[PDB]
Design a protein around this nucleic acid. Sequence first.
DNA 1: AGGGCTGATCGTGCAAAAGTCGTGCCAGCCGTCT
DNA 2: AGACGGCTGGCACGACTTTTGCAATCGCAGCCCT
Lengths: 50, 100, 50, 50, 415
Amino acid sequence: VPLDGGRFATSDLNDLYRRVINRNNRLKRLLDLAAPDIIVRNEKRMLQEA
Amino acid sequence: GPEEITADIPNVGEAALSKLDESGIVYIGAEVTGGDILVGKVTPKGETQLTPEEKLLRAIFGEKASDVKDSSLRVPNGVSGTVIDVQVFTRDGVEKDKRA
Amino acid sequence: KDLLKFLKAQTKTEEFDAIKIALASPDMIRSWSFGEVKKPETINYRTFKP
Amino acid sequence: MGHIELASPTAHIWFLKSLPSRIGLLLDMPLRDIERVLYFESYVVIEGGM
Amino acid sequence: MKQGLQLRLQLAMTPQLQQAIRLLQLSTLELQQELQQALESNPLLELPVYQGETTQTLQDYLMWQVELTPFTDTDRAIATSIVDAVDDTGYLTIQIEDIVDSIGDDEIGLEEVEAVLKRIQRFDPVGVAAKDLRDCLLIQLSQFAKETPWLEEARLIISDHLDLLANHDFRTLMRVTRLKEEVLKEAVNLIQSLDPRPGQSIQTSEPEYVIPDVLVRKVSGRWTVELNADSIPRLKINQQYAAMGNSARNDADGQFIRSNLQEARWLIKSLESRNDTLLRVSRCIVEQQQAFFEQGEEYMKPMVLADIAQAVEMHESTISRVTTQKYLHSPRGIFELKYFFSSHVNTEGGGEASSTAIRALVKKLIAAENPAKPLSDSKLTSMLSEQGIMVARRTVAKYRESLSIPPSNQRKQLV
DNA sequence: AGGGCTGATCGTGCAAAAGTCGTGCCAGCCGTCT
DNA sequence: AGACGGCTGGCACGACTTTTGCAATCGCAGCCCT
């Protein structure tokens, strides 16, 4: 549903979905290097939350 | 490409253009009925190649090359009338000022 | 495709009777989905494509 | 429709969070206890008879 | 004394700032693409429907009529295939033979394809599926009644005399077609209004696409230029991991996390400094623009990489990478940084600079010469002599091609 | 208590090759024209 | 009707620009073994 002529703005139509994909990718990058416990747990908690 | 107000809508009838002046600004004071174009703008598009079909087209007719599409403004549907006054906002940086 | 039934194959409806509702496990989540998501970008503004 | 890999598990935050604590019903997980646990916030024993 | 070169005045390079410059010369759209693809692993580096209305898109509007038109399964398939490879202008993309091959029916022949196309040639609009448009304008005129005069002259011209009008060769056209003097132009004009690319007419709508990266608003003379704040990338240091490192029992592992974080902080600060150096460079450029842009591209001095890098301490490579693929929205609008520089010349304006909008408005005046014929390069030279700035006919042809003007003996038209 | 000692540091701009343009200017041409 | 011409562009050569593509030493001192 583009608004300004420029930007589409499927806000939460993907902003939730997009944030989800983004954190998912970040995780796939991080814990594969034997993630630090604090970071990994906080991230997974945010993941469940999101 | 910049869309331009020239009333030069391609594939258009003169009577539609007839109420339009050189600007596309239709002469002030006319009646309106139906949905004819009030502001005559065109959207520039990307250029054509050698394009033997389009080459032969621009050889036959030319001056258009489909370079722009009729990108014009008209009277609202079922809403008609005659004007009493008008307005326009030219941002600084362009100095067209056609019927303006 | 003979282009007569391929056009014709678009439209048909079934009995669909006795609509049920029950839970679901992720294997069929892979099955129903024609794919799984990987990136949080949706389209371009540089070319405006998927 | 698409899918996603989802290595980080995803129970229905729907599940067991309504009046029927379904998971609290199945694992007998006490709602306070299960609640503390899922925030990755308990490190509760899982099994272990020795 | 005895001159020459004499010994006087090493280590290891790394592509660090080099990759950074690779980013900067790369455009901020894909540059942010990498910036995301970069910050991903660096863990310390930070309705659904609305209006939801469908449209015709023309070809489906043609299909709408085809559905109401009587057609067979093979006829529907041929018409649909014809519709599939259709251009925006409304001309046929593939030839009849390619359509026959696509149908893949030996029963399907070129004649059946032509009959199907013709039954669908003028349904909506006239001149659809032009198929190397020429007979398309012919069908359009045929749609018009013969009561219109000079229809015969226009028809004979369009029959096999497209070339004579292609070069605007009115004398050769009259000598060939034996067309009437001062009257054949009437057939030419009736042909001129023939709805070319009539399918292009349906297409009219677009959304906006240009990214204001920097903004100079001409704030009280000598514009207050400012970049786009949201467009400027920035990371957030993992303060949690910053506090998750030292106390880590592996104080080595956590302090190494701290060290990598500090290095990335250096990287981000360097990028911001790159932005700020581009910004002060933009300040100089905007000082230039308060006259140039305010006087427009016509009164614009050609600048050089040397010239700008001199005003800064930035290296010539530094700037040369810095601005690559950069555009800013100004009071004029969104303008590219790569557009900023221009080659200088030997004009007798007392100096060396670039043609630009001078060349464009020169094309404008050369066209503004009697609409009978385009102004030749001598006209440009005289116009420049009036301008008091030296310009040459080879230079004129150059600047005209820069303005992409039509040739002198190609743009001659009946007044 | 001495040796070895070894890889632990930490940078970046400009050059060299390339390209690439200004600028015009000769060859063919078209206009037409006397 | 044939040389006129004005143009235009290929042609080439300088004039300017221009990116890319390099690769530790001086110490250190910690380690490790002996």
